[PDB]
Amino acid sequence: DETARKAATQLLDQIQDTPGRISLNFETPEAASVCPIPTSLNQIVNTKWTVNQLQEGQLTMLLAQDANKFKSLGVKNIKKGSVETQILPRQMDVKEIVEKLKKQDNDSDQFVGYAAAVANVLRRCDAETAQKITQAITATIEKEAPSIVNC
Amino acid sequence: TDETARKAATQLLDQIQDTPGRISLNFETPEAASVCPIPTSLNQIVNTKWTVNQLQEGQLTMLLAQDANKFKSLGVKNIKKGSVETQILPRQMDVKEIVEKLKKQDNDSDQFVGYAAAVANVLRRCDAETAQKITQAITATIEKEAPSIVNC
Amino acid sequence: DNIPDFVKETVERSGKNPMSLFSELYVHMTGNTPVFDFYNRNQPNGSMKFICVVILNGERIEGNVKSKKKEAKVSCSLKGLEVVLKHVSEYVVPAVKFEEKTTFFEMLREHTYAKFYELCKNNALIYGFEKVIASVFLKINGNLQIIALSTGNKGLRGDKIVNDGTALIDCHAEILARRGLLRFLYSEVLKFSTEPPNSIFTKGKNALVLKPGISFHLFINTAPCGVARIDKKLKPGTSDDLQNSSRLRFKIDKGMGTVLGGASEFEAPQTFDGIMMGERMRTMSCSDKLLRANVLGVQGAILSHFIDPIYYSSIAVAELNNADRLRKAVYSRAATFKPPAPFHVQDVEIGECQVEDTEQSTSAAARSTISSMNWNLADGNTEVVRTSDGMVHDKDMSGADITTPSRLCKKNMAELMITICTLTKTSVDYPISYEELKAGSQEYAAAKKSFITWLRQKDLGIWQRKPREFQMFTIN
Amino acid sequence: DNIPDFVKETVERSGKNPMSLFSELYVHMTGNTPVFDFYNRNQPNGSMKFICVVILNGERIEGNVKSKKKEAKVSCSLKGLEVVLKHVSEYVVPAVKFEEKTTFFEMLREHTYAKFYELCKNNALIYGFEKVIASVFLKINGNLQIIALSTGNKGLRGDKIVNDGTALIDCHAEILARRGLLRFLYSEVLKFSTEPPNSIFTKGKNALVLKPGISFHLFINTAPCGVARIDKKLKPGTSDDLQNSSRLRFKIDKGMGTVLGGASEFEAPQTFDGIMMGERMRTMSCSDKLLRANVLGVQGAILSHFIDPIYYSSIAVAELNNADRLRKAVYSRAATFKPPAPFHVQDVEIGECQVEDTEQSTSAAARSTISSMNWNLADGNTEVVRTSDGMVHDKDMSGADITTPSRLCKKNMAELMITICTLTKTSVDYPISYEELKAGSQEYAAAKKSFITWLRQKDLGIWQRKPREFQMFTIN
Numbered sequence A: 001d002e003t004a005r006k007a008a009t010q011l012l013d014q015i016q017d018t019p020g021r022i023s024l025n026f027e028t029p030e031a032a033s034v035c036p037i038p039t040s041l042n043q044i045v046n047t048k049w050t051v052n053q054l055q056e057g058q059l060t061m062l063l064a065q066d067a068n069k070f071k072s073l074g075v076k077n078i079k080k081g082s083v084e085t086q087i088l089p090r091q092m093d094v095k096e097i098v099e100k101l102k103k104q105d106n107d108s109d110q111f112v113g114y115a116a117a118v119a120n121v122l123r124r125c126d127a128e129t130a131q132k133i134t135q136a137i138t139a140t141i142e143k144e145a146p147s148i149v150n151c
Numbered sequence B: 001t002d003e004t005a006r007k008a009a010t011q012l013l014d015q016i017q018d019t020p021g022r023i024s025l026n027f028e029t030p031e032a033a034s035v036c037p038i039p040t041s042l043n044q045i046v047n048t049k050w051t052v053n054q055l056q057e058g059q060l061t062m063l064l065a066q067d068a069n070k071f072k073s074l075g076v077k078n079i080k081k082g083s084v085e086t087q088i089l090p091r092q093m094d095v096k097e098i099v100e101k102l103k104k105q106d107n108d109s110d111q112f113v114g115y116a117a118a119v120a121n122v123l124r125r126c127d128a129e130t131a132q133k134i135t136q137a138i139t140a141t142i143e144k145e146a147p148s149i150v151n152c
Numbered sequence C, D: 001d002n003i004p005d006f007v008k009e010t011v012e013r014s015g016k017n018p019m020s021l022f023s024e025l026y027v028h029m030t031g032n033t034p035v036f037d038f039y040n041r042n043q044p045n046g047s048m049k050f051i052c053v054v055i056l057n058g059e060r061i062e063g064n065v066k067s068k069k070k071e072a073k074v075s076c077s078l079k080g081l082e083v084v085l086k087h088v089s090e091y092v093v094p095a096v097k098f099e100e101k102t103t104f105f106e107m108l109r110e111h112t113y114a115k116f117y118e119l120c121k122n123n124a125l126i127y128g129f130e131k132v133i134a135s136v137f138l139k140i141n142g143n144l145q146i147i148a149l150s151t152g153n154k155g156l157r158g159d160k161i162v163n164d165g166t167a168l169i170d171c172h173a174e175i176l177a178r179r180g181l182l183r184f185l186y187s188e189v190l191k192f193s194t195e196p197p198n199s200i201f202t203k204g205k206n207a208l209v210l211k212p213g214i215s216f217h218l219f220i221n222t223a224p225c226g227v228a229r230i231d232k233k234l235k236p237g238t239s240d241d242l243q244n245s246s247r248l249r250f251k252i253d254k255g256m257g258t259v260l261g262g263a264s265e266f267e268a269p270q271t272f273d274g275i276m277m278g279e280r281m282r283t284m285s286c287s288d289k290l291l292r293a294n295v296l297g298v299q300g301a302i303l304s305h306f307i308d309p310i311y312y313s314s315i316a317v318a319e320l321n322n323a324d325r326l327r328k329a330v331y332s333r334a335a336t337f338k339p340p341a342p343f344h345v346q347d348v349e350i351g352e353c354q355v356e357d358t359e360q361s362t363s364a365a366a367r368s369t370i371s372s373m374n375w376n377l378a379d380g381n382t383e384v385v386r387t388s389d390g391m392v393h394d395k396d397m398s399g400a401d402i403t404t405p406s407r408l409c410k411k412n413m414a415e416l417m418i419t420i421c422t423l424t425k426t427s428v429d430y431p432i433s434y435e436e437l438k439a440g441s442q443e444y445a446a447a448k449k450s451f452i453t454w455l456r457q458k459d460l461g462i463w464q465r466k467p468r469e470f471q472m473f474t475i476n
């Protein structure tokens, strides 16, 4: 228990003298063990940048400056049209799809409910499952109805 | 306020309480016309013989009770015209090329509405026996391809 | 049991849970709110009980002692409902008003509510429909008589649409009032056909013309949805903001608000099959419909074959600001338009109600209702229409559900129009469809097409016309 | 006179009498005015003395015996001041904890509390809103620095909405921290525009790239709303309730807590006019917005034109912290998603503090406040806004009422970006609106749309987007 208390008392004084600024102590096994940072967050970089270069109210100071000093960044902004699409299709529960998918007298309803159920089933599918389902859809439609498809 | 004005006001609230839907105003007295003024664009004082009392509740039902001979022709002739387009009628026919494009289209940003419409149109022409068998196979395909959607 | 069956029948007919209806009635007749009590009863071996009593009209409404909360509270609610069915009375408020100022429209507002309660005393099932109220008044040389009265602020659902036209699409009060006005105009045309002197119509050069001094006034208890309710700002600040605020909007199903579309958006026409697949129906807001009615008349295309165009003379809304806000939505947008002859732009008078703005009772917890009601002087009886499907539901002799089309549906209007054909010996082509009959008015169709083209040219918006299948049914 | 000297020195520093300071503190704490009472009593020596009584937060406070009414009122005001000041009510600074354990986030919590208390010395009125806090720490190598600080746990009312974007939508603490981080990034971009060596950015390919070793850390005083922060003893039920543990959750205006989606009213998008008359406005919960920030970055869409996406490194929660639940709320439910490049799912670290005591906690059972405060390193000064309207209020000439847009509003960000582009000599299309400006970033918009579509596909829920009218104002 040597250098541990002397290391900890510096952080215990930082919270009062200089709130909001933390300076960890390294290059000492007894001092680094006091506040073990997570290994995922323990990254060592030897960059020349420092945390004391920041200044309070830097936005006001930068704004109140001549425009000559500042330089361009070589970027361009262009207009773009937004997406107005609302929630277009009405949703129904999984159980509600099931009963319409197994209805017998679909001919009298012109297969409207069956088509709606198929469409909502396609909606729940992902990019690949929907595409494969569509390919099977067309394959089984063409195979069973040559008079309508094979023209 | 006043005495004439107060009498007119009492008459107005009495009419409100007793006979809803009927409004009677006073114009022969300038004081009686100031309590409830009418906008100058809607006054339009005119001389006519018609009156409110000619209107009767349920006059429509009573009217059809009369027989034909009391009704006179208005001398108006009606001819149908201006048919919009010779487009078939109940969207029963989607052109073969159009439905082939709809069924084989890859871009499905239309929320699968067109694909379902094409499937329904194809199913409508199919005969009773061959459409029902397509239903069983199509339900089997839906069940097998994405069980997680329906197994819940 | 201790609960009469008539109380249960009343509860079922009201459509509300017994507790909510009992609390509402308690608030109506008394200045307090019911508070239940849960005193316990102890058996020798120990037990927990619930009763609930509530004190209304000084009667002991103590319910049956039961084990759990649910049965005790429903029994107490049923007993309180028996109590309110006893001593038949209902909510009533005397009317007071300030005078010597501009209060002509206040008389229309007060009389509309008074006429509303008169029908309520005959049919108590229409109570609570005060959220949206519209009426049409007819003025003849200082004498005014009410013509139509209707309620409703919802629309037809997408999955309940039909191609036969027996289901109402829009159930808004300001449209049902117009439908009742058209029915009254049909009755007036029939009266002219049988008794010209007793009718308001007279023979003109080309068609029937209203007699001098005849004017129609429309009153709405709230501002119509659309442009008139977007904002309350005094100034737009920029020209772009003024253009954006005046653009057209559309409604979606039972949605209370409106959606604004940009230029060349929703250009693809709506399809009958697409709606059934899940696409939401788009219907123009009441402000744009009022603008269209002012521009092209309220008689419509079908009635244009016999009578001249008719426009509203004054519009009254019970709101404090009013004035320029409603004028900009109703007249200023189409002020520069130059329609052909006949039909023209009408400078309808805009009026503000004295006092008693109706927003607390029109925008607080009253939106849960789904049933709309319409009334007209021509029929003389009240009708209730479910906004979910646009049809009236009733119980048959066996208690099962039976549905019949409303009297203001497209099929009934076509049947009445054909009856007018038959009665006045007016032969018509056969067979004809509903769309073909409307297209027969060359002048009205040309004026409507010109107005739509001018609206498109002025980048105000794109009209979302209904699919043709809604009017494809044949007339028999 | 039993009055601590710190009250007197704070009063002297504030430059106002104790009555004025107490009145200002009461106005900030509650939404009403203080109630005062006085008593007159005789004395054995024949003198007359006065006693003053005031009510603070529903608690009766009686002042000391004084010879004048004003002196008694001053004493009562001083007592109320001592009651409301946490400097002596609970503690000044604890500044003591146990070391040698993996509690690095305890240091951040202590540092942000110390910073909040230090800011409370420059402004003695901002005391009392420490119920919920949030902050952002900048970490380079072994050095830490706070850059953000804000409070607030309520949202904008539905009747105070505006279309010009000068009113804040969400006033919770976490969102304001990100809003201030946006301003800090703007200041860093300007610093890079003149001093690339002194800035945190570097000239990398495809716009600016953050320098290596620089990371951002977020600390939250309490568990965010939504999936986390569950304190119900009923416990989870069947599998349907288990699925509800990952469903999307929304906030409710003028309410408390969060609601579960899937009801009979969440269909159709919100409307400006409908919300204006009383429709409930839906706002995404804190955990939901944390998930969005983790997936798509915290820089937003507007800033994506200049800098690469930036993601948080660690999240710490002091009270009601669950390591398993917090990870599931923000990371587990979207780990399988694969956003397009350069966007990627960040495996944020979940941290917990050391001290937690419910009995002395100030989480929910304490008094609530209507105003919230925010502090920013770039600005260097604190700002106080009212949650009911999201607008800064001030007084002049000892009266009147001035309404001022907040620095974190959308309009202020738009002006800041316009100045950013003009000072950098980068041409922008004119005229342009806020909605069009955000849509300019093709990569960010596509990623957001893909994320929304993936959320919809996996039956987690529906993202409730705000109406378009909130962002149609033109930027000049």
Ligand SMILES: O=P(O)(O)O[C@H]1[C@@H](OP(=O)(O)O)[C@@H](OP(=O)(O)O)[C@@H](OP(=O)(O)O)[C@@H](OP(=O)(O)O)[C@H]1OP(=O)(O)O
Residues within 6 Å of the ligand: C169, C170, C175, C283, C284, C289, C300, C301, C302, C410, C438, C464, C465, C466, C467
């Ligand atoms: O008063 P509404 O209930 O809104 O009905 C009208 C009416 O249709 P009806 O035939 O049901 O009265 C219109 O027709 P006109 O009176 O102008 O002849 C018009 O239909 P058209 O333009 O086809 O004539 C329009 O319908 P749409 O919006 O499809 O144009 C609209 O009906 P909605 O209820 O559909 O708005």
Ligand SMILES: O=P(O)(O)O[C@H]1[C@@H](OP(=O)(O)O)[C@@H](OP(=O)(O)O)[C@@H](OP(=O)(O)O)[C@@H](OP(=O)(O)O)[C@H]1OP(=O)(O)O
Residues within 6 Å of the ligand: D169, D170, D175, D283, D284, D289, D300, D301, D302, D410, D413, D438, D464, D465, D466
């Ligand atoms: O509140 P924030 O944390 O700043 O999130 C907001 C905002 O959310 P709120 O409306 O709840 O404030 C919007 O998102 P939606 O709610 O509309 O989904 C909008 O984002 P969108 O424009 O994509 O909708 C917005 O931008 P801003 O902060 O500039 O107001 C930003 O989200 P984005 O920056 O990602 O756009």
Ligand SMILES: [Zn+2]
Residues within 6 Å of the ligand: C172, C224, C225, C285, C286, C287
């Ligand atoms: Zn409307």
